[PDB]
Design a protein around this ligand. Structure first.
Ligand SMILES: *[C@@H]1O[C@H](CO)[C@@H](O[C@@H]2O[C@H](CO)[C@@H](O)[C@H](O)[C@H]2NC(C)=O)[C@H](O)[C@H]1NC(C)=O
Ligand SMILES: *[C@@H]1O[C@H](CO)[C@@H](O)[C@H](O)[C@H]1NC(C)=O
Ligand SMILES: *[C@@H]1O[C@H](CO)[C@@H](O)[C@H](O)[C@H]1NC(C)=O
Ligand SMILES: *[C@@H]1O[C@H](CO)[C@@H](O)[C@H](O)[C@H]1NC(C)=O
Lengths: 45, 87, 371, 36, 249, 49
């Protein structure tokens, strides 16, 4: 998606992607709307 | 009667109802201590009934730092072609 | 730089006798960076305001120092004289809307990039171009912690008279049966021993048997009632989120309010669905969050609404306030800059780098993770 | 009133009716052994 | 009732017969393994409590029923604890509205004049209309304050308004008569003009609203016990009966 | 079976956001930012959440 946006193929990316250093340099992101990040989910007194 | 031969036995016997080996006038009023004992037991039981109703949450855990050092091996796992690998 | 006095982020305390920041060390032993701020100490209007050089430190100053080291800043940290965030208001000639507080100072030249709990808002973003948020912390509702919570019969206390009458009648019946087949109080002593196990002791036999069988019924019922009283046990849920039935009907008995025309007031004005309740908080607002939380502690205000990063930190620091509601209006923070600032891209990149690395985690551990 | 109490009552009734029968012969055997 | 079948042991037959049969079996087995009634009944009624002061191989096998006795005691305690966790007119069909004079306190009902309720009651209860007109209210506020104070025994009005007021009543001391006992269930609708070329669209719009969930969304966001007294009386009566039976010998 | 649980809610390692990616230097940045801020400030975001 980022590659498609960068090389004039698309002008907007509504898909769910995070924000990183390399991501924010090639293209500019708007304000986030969903909080995300790195987390661990594991299976199961 | 005896200072400790009967008073201690009665005090430790009144705490439970199933006191078979339990035996003038002063002791009669001291016997009301079983009321306090049973009330305290009931309160403790009620409190117990009322109150009877993973990892270290981060990447600083020693399991992540030392996966093979511990006896249970770990696999972790990440989705490639994304941002987690760069992170 | 302009900052607002908020305890979790900007510790505004008077300097030493000389007039410089006092040397302090954290629990870990590392030195605590401090920056001298020239804000007005006085808060009440009409006082002889003085721009004394206090000392400001906390969560935001570490990020400011990181930005300075990564982009060669010369920050002075001029604390806002108004002591308020401020979004929109008018005083005289009510035909135009002007910004007051940190936002007004930033817009009217003067100040510069803002490191503060200034959240991201629509009208704020219309005139001020923010950066990537460094902490989202959707604002929640703070309430006073409930105080810790029937020695005799809870109700219908005639049971004592009933059991006394039962003891008397069984005693007289036992005496009559013994006479037909033990003077003043032996029967009542036996009844008390039956009620309270202590090992102290045909018509009389069956009478005693039925009396002893009924004796345990009263204590069993008492124990059952005491155990079953766990259902209510007071401790009713305070608020549990904005979208709850009890907040749909405002009441003067349960008073709550925000601080000022901050992001909370703008959010309430924007969401026009319960204006009848929203107008309730307008008449009893407080000058600052510190005053509001002090009033809540003094039981002046039942509930308080503010950013979660402040409410949870205050709850952790002082074990007498508890937050209610999980999350609503999740709007992050930001570095309030000017639309002509050329550092926007680099400020955003620095914020993203801090988020990617452990700098934000270390700052949270050393500034928001307490007992 | 329902299945639980009725079932436990049936179980304890079977237990006691078996226990009396076994304890009768147990006591008889004990007495015979002690008084052979 | 108090300490009766509704409180516990609703059947009140199986438990009694079970107690009788287990008592008989215990007496018989105790006699088979000193006295038929002088000791067997004494032990049977003394094993239910731990304070058996006058307690005196055979007893070892008898004592296994004490496990059942204590299990029954614990089950009864648990059932009593569990069974204590928690609107008489029931419409106009009852004799209270038809014959208010049969009750010593006069009935003071309530209906707002010039409404759809006083008109409705005329065509079904002709003579009752004169009684209703005796107690009238200017509006709904007067009726509600009279109900709170006690001036009106009951209020008759539109179901939706009464339900809203009950749902938003201070202290929750006002409530309608259950649900489903509506005297004349109807709707609200929206008035139009005879032959107006708008009903054919209004009805379709309303049906679309109620079929798309809009109507439900609009509705949302807008609107010591008595046994203790009976138990002591019952045990006293039983003791007196036993005493009389023993004395009649 | 609800047998999967994450590490709390506030223990996110690198707490970031998703957002929407636009082409560099696109004229729609201001409009997208304002619309996202309006959605966050209003109840549309809560309804979708
Ligand atoms: C913002 O950052 C950019 C890049 O970090 C600066 O542009 C130059 O970028 C090159 C490499 O791309 C560096 O070698 C230069 O040192 C950067 N210039 C300077 C003056 O450091 C840009 O100048 C920065 N803008 C501001 C206002 O700090
Ligand atoms: C995408 O993922 C596949 C398998 O996960 C991998 O083989 C491929 O190299 C990845 N693409 C890139 C560009 O690395
Ligand atoms: C800015 O700071 C950097 C430190 O990374 C330094 O190398 C550079 O010389 C500084 N530039 C100016 C103009 O002070
Ligand atoms: C009802 O209508 C009559 C018409 O005669 C009028 O006299 C009376 O005041 C009205 N009452 C109310 C409560 O509107």
């Amino acid at each position: 998606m980022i590659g498609e946006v960068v090389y004039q193929r698309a002008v907007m990316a509504v898909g769910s992607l995070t924000i990183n250093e390399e991501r924010s340099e090639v293209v500019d992101f708007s304000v986030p709307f969903v909080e995300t990040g790195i987390s661990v989910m594991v299976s199961r007194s | 009667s005896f200072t400790i031969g009967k008073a201690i036995w009665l005090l430790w016997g009144l705490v439970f109802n199933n006191s078979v080996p339990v035996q003038t006038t002063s002791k009669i009023m001291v016997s009301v201590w079983a009321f306090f004992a049973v009330i305290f037991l009931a309160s403790y039981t009620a409190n117990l009934a009322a109150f009877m109703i993973d990892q270290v949450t981060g990447l600083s855990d020693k399991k992540f730092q030392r996966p093979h050092d511990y006896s249970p091996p770990f696999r972790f796992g990440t989705v490639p072609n994304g941002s987690t690998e760069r992170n | 730089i302009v900052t607002i006095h908020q305890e979790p982020f900007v510790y505004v305390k008077p300097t030493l006798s000389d007039g410089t920041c006092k040397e302090e060390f954290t629990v870990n032993g590392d030195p605590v960076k401090k920056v001298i701020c020239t804000g007005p100490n006085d808060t009440s209007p009409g006082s002889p305001r003085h721009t004394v050089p206090q000392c400001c430190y906390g969560f935001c100053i570490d990020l400011l120092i990181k930005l300075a080291r990564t982009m060669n800043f010369t920050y002075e940290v001029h604390l806002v004289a108004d002591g308020k965030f401020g979004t929109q208001e008018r005083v005289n000639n009510s035909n135009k809307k002007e910004w007051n507080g940190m936002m007004g100072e930033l817009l009217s030249g003067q100040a510069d990039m803002i490191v503060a709990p200034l959240t991201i808002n629509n009208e704020r973003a219309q005139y001020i171009e923010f950066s990537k948020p460094f902490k989202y912390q959707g604002l929640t509702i703070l309430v006073k912690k409930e105080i810790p919570r029937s020695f005799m019969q809870p109700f219908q206390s005639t049971l004592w008279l009933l059991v006394g009458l039962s003891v008397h009648v069984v005693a007289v019946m036992l005496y009559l049966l013994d006479r037909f087949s033990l003077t003043l109080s032996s029967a009542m002593w036996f009844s008390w021993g039956v009620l309270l196990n202590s090992g102290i002791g045909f018509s009389a036999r069956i009478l005693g048997m039925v009396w002893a069988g009924f004796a345990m019924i009263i204590v069993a019922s008492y124990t059952a009632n005491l155990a079953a009283f766990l259902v209510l046990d007071r401790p009713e849920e305070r608020i549990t989120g904005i979208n709850d039935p009890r907040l749909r009907n405002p009441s003067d008995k349960f008073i709550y309010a925000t601080v000022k025309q901050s992001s909370v007031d703008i959010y309430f004005r924007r969401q026009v669905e319960l204006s009848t309740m929203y107008r309730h908080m307008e008449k009893h607002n407080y000058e600052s969050a510190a005053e509001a939380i002090q009033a809540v502690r003094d039981n002046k205000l039942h509930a308080f609404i503010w950013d979660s990063a402040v409410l949870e930190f205050e709850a952790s620091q002082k074990c007498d306030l508890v937050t209610t509601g999980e999350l609503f209006f999740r709007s992050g923070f930001g570095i309030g800059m000017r639309k002509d600032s050329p550092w926007k891209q680099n400020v955003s990149l620095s914020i993203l780098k801090s988020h990617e690395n452990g700098f934000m985690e270390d700052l949270d551990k050393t500034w928001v993770r307490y007992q | 009133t329902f299945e639980n109490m009725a079932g436990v009552f049936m179980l304890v009734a079977g237990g006691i009716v078996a226990g009396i029968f076994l304890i009768f012969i147990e006591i008889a055997y004990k007495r015979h052994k002690d008084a052979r | 009732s108090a300490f009766l079948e509704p409180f516990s042991a609703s059947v009140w037959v199986m438990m009694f017969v079970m107690l009788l049969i287990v008592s008989a079996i215990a007496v018989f087995v105790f006699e088979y393994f000193s006295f038929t009634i002088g000791k067997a009944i004494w032990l049977l009624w003394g094993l239910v409590f731990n304070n058996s002061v006058p307690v005196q191989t055979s007893k070892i096998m008898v004592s296994v029923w004490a496990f059942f006795a204590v299990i029954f005691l614990a089950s009864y305690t648990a059932n009593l604890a569990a069974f204590m966790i928690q609107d008489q007119v029931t419409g106009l069909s009852d004799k209270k509205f038809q014959r208010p004079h049969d009750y010593s306190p006069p009935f003071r009902f309530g209906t707002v004049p010039n409404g759809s309720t006083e008109r409705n009651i005329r065509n079904n209860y002709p003579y009752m209309h004169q009684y209703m007109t005796k107690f009238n209210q200017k509006g709904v506020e007067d009726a509600l304050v009279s109900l709170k104070t006690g001036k009106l025994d009951a209020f008759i009005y539109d179901a939706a308004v009464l339900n809203y007021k009950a749902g938003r009543d201070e202290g929750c001391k006002l409530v309608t008569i259950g649900s489903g006992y509506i005297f004349a269930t109807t709707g609200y609708g929206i008035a139009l003009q005879k032959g107006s070329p708008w009903k054919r669209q209004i009805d379709l719009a309303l049906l679309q609203f109620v079929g798309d969930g809009e109507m439900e969304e609009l509705e949302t966001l807008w609107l010591l016990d008595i046994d203790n007294m009976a138990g002591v009386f019952y045990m006293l009566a039983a003791a007196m009966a036993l005493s009389l039976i023993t004395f009649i010998w």
